[PDB]
Design a protein around this ligand. Structure first.
Ligand SMILES: [Zn+2]
Ligand SMILES: [Zn+2]
Length: 92
């Protein structure tokens, strides 16, 4: 479906890294101010990274156990600019 029914074939700009100090509960900033992402409980992680909620960014999310990182003000600036670096080109 990646090239015929669903164009959301990847998350290259949304797959934000996790905070290293938060992995041992020794970080010094909240999720709203840190340099990396801070998963809650239901948030799914892969290879030391977490996917930001595309549904929350596009205006579709309504979950209570969302597996994706709702983007904080300190990282929305990074996600905007990461998205702008790829949204400028498409073929399918
Ligand atoms: Zn942190
Ligand atoms: Zn969400």
């Amino acid at each position: 479906m990646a090239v015929s029914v669903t164009p959301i074939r990847d998350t290259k700009w949304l797959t934000l890294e996790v905070c290293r100090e938060f992995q041992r509960g020794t970080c010094s900033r909240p999720d709203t101010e840190c340099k990396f992402a801070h998963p809650s409980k239901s948030c799914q992680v892969e290879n030391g990274r977490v996917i930001a909620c595309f549904d929350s960014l596009k205006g579709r999310c309504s979950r209570e156990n969302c597996k994706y990182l709702h983007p904080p003000p300190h990282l929305k600036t990074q996600l905007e600019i990461n998205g702008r670096n790829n949204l400028i080109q498409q073929k399918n």
